[PDB]
From Swiss-Prot:
Keywords: 3Fe-4S, 4Fe-4S, DNA-binding, Electron transport, Iron, Iron-sulfur, Metal-binding, Repeat, Transport. This is Ferredoxin-1. [3Fe-4S] cluster binds at residues 8, 16, 49. Residues 95-106 have a biased composition (Basic and acidic residues). Residues 1-29, 30-59 form the 4Fe-4S ferredoxin-type domain. PANTHER family: FERREDOXIN, OXIDOREDUCTASE.
Length: 106
């Protein structure tokens, strides 16, 4: 399973969803998560995230380990997304800000 981590919060470019062969991504207000039972680890998405937020589960940084379980839990409540859409409005101002998990909306 690939894991979407912090920097996607408040950026949500959705460039990642075009490349996906299965419907692995599930959509929230300002973040996207990958459903771990459905990702087939094709690795195609992580070169596409402008925010460089997608990691192989085995490569999620020490300080971002929360995300592995977050992606699994939210993937069970959030709707599947399959079309790219426009990035959230202020996406570049937040790209690269650390500590964005305090801003996650459900
Ligand atoms: S690695 Fe592939 S199957 Fe997995 S979330 Fe990315 S695009 Fe989807
Ligand atoms: S910022 Fe998020 S919506 Fe996808 S393209 Fe990157 S993981």
């Amino acid at each position: 399973a690939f894991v979407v981590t912090d920097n996607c919060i408040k950026c949500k470019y959705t460039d990642c969803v075009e490349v996906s062969p299965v419907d692995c991504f599930y959509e929230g207000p300002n973040f996207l998560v990958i459903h771990p039972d459905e990702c087939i680890d094709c690795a195609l998405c992580e070169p596409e995230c402008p925010a460089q937020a997608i990691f192989s589960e085995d490569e999620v940084p020490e300080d971002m380990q929360e995300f592995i379980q977050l992606n699994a839990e939210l993937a069970e409540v959030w709707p599947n997304i399959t079309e790219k859409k426009d990035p959230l409005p202020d996406a570049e101002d937040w790209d690269g800000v650390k500590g964005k998990l305090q801003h996650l909306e459900r």
